[PDB]
Amino acid sequence: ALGKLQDVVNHNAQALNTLVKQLSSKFGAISSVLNDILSRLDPPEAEVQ
Amino acid sequence: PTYGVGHQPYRVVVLSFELLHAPATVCGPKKSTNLVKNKCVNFNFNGLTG
């Protein structure tokens, strides 16, 4: 019966969950963690990553 | 020995590592500090900084 309101709540929560989940994506870099990139590479290549 | 560079014998050693995906057993010379609880600190556990 109340599918429309719950649907809106679901879309908002799903969008935030997807946006949080996207932080675990390498995006073509060596790691998805910035601290690892800093702890492992020199500034010329860490800047690229 | 008479040949110039480009044909002389070269000794090559390849060091291979793995990054963070297992418990580590080879570490750097950094000294261990004491552990503190319930306080905001910048820690370094086995090369993992946070």
Side-chain angles (χ1 to χ4, degrees):
Chain A
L2 270 310
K4 302 188 60 46
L5 311 184
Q6 186 70 66
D7 191 6
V8 176
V9 171
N10 285 359
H11 289 302
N12 291 304
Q14 168 199 260
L16 287 177
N17 290 339
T18 300
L19 182 75
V20 158
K21 174 69 64 73
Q22 281 295 96
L23 285 187
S24 75
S25 298
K26 309 246 173 184
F27 294 122
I30 54 160
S31 185
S32 57
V33 177
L34 281 170
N35 284 333
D36 293 6
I37 292 182
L38 293 175
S39 80
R40 279 164 56 176
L41 292 181
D42 279 338
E45 59 267 19
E47 157 168 357
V48 178
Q49 304 299 311
Chain B
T2 56
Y3 289 97
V5 295
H7 298 288
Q8 281 177 25
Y10 268 68
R11 283 179 180 212
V12 174
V13 166
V14 182
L15 298 180
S16 176
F17 300 100
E18 79 90 12
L19 259 308
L20 221 73
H21 285 74
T25 42
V26 180
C27 286
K30 291 198 60 178
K31 296 284 97 183
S32 310
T33 307
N34 192 352
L35 56 97
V36 292
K37 297 278 187 154
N38 308 80
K39 262 173 293 293
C40 185
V41 288
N42 42 329
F43 47 81
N44 190 337
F45 284 77
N46 308 12
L48 175 72
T49 63

